């Protein structure tokens, strides 16, 4: 098991899903089509912002 | 593949694959029947000759 973490804007939360096309999903972080595992996302406005 | 996302494309393409695969199965299992109705005729002609 290896975990990957990063901070993204709320407008690209859905782009983490495999098969999504976009500026961030194609140029920053893309998941494989037969991706195994899953992600955890939340609005951490208190700390990051 | 060029119009739909890959997350459901495998599901989408599966029922297209089984459609052709099942159709080929129907043709071959009927072609064997027509062989039997010919294999019977071949033996009849062989006895006739």
């Amino acid at each position: 098991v290896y975990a990957d973490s990063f901070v993204i804007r709320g407008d690209e939360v859905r782009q983490i899903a495999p098969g999504q096309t976009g500026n961030i999903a194609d140029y920053n972080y893309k998941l494989p089509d037969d991706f195994t595992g899953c992600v955890i996302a939340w609005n951490s406005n208190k700390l990051d912002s | 593949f060029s119009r739909l996302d890959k997350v459901e494309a495998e599901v989408q393409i599966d029922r297209l694959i089984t459609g052709r695969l099942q159709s080929l199965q129907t043709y071959v299992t009927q072609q064997l029947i027509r062989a039997a109705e010919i294999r019977a005729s071949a033996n009849l002609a062989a006895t006739k000759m």
Side-chain angles (χ1 to χ4, degrees), chain A residues 18-49:
Chain A
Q20 299 319 300
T21 54
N23 289 337
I24 184 167
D26 312 334
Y27 283 1
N28 304 144
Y29 194 81
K30 184 174 175 65
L31 273 189
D33 189 358
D34 51 320
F35 167 62
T36 59
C38 62
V39 307
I40 303 164
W42 69 96
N43 195 1
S44 83
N45 215 25
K46 293 179 179 179
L47 268 298
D48 310 345
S49 183

Side-chain angles (χ1 to χ4, degrees), chain B:
Chain B
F1 284 160
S2 82
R3 295 180 297 109
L4 301 181
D5 52 357
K6 277 74 69 177
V7 64
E8 51 87 21
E10 291 326 280
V11 163
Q12 180 54 259
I13 198 66
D14 191 81
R15 82 170 169 268
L16 184 49
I17 292 299
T18 198
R20 288 173 184 164
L21 187 57
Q22 205 279 332
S23 172
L24 182 55
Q25 194 73 215
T26 300
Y27 159 73
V28 68
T29 190
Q30 179 274 348
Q31 186 65 35
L32 268 165
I33 301 299
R34 205 50 43 76
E37 293 276 277
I38 288 304
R39 184 54 189 169
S41 174
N43 282 351
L44 172 58
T47 304
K48 283 268 195 62
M49 181 155 298

